[PDB]
Design a binder for this molecule. Structure first.
Ligand SMILES: CNc1nc2nc(-c3ccc(P(=O)(O)O)cc3)n(CCOc3ccc(Cl)cc3)c2c(=O)[nH]1
Length: 187
């Protein structure tokens, strides 16, 4: 006597995500430049979000997007972030053209579609940096000492972007990034 959900039910993601924007407006404190766009926990709502906002390639230099599981703030300071690190994809300025938007989207669909299976717990979120000096996309993991997790994650990622095995990508811990110029792991 009830309706068959398939038709009218939204498709719930395994997690609620929060999309954040950072605009480099040099006359404000960094923490205050970072602002929450919106949150979503369903497939339909993700596409509503993605489609109504600018492609990463059309953001001006010094701006960022990032997507984090709800309750993880997208900064080193977060409880789930302080012991962690990231897989860094350094894109040059010719890959802003052919790669950026599809690397970022693939990243988004990796997070919310939980492509890391078991390891999906160690995932916190991801960041795309638009810079004049060449762009960045990073995946944040929770613990920079879970080698089995960190490296399987980084390897599924590399594969999921379609990167050839010539290209190596490195994982830096947050404590190193936050204090320094170097990779804990490479794939
Ligand atoms: C003490 N508070 C604090 N300051 C920070 N400064 C950075 C940071 C890291 C790298 C670069 P770069 O690529 O220009 O070299 C610039 C700044 N971060 C890391 C997060 O960055 C994010 C940027 C944008 C978004 Cl949408 C999310 C995170 C933090 C942070 O986590 N906490």
């Amino acid at each position: 006597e009830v309706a068959n959900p398939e038709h009218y039910i939204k498709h719930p993601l395994q997690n609620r995500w929060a999309l954040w924007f950072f605009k480099n407006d040099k006359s404000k404190t960094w923490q205050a430049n970072l602002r929450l766009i919106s949150k979503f926990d369903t497939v339909e709502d993700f596409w509503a979000l993605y489609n109504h906002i600018q492609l990463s390639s059309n953001l001006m230099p010094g701006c960022d997007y990032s997507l984090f599981k709800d309750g993880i703030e997208p900064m080193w300071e977060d409880e789930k972030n302080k012991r962690g690190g990231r897989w860094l994809i350094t894109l040059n300025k010719q890959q802003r053209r052919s790669d950026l938007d599809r690397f970022w989207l693939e990243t988004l669909l990796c997070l919310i579609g939980e492509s890391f299976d078991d390891y999906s717990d160690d995932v916190c979120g991801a960041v795309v940096n638009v810079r004049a000096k060449g762009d960045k996309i990073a995946i944040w993991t929770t613990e920079c000492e879970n080698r089995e997790a960190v490296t399987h994650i980084g390897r599924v990622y590399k594969e999921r972007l379609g990167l050839p095995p010539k290209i190596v990508i490195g994982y830096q811990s947050h404590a190193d990034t936050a204090t320094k110029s170097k990779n804990r792991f490479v794939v």
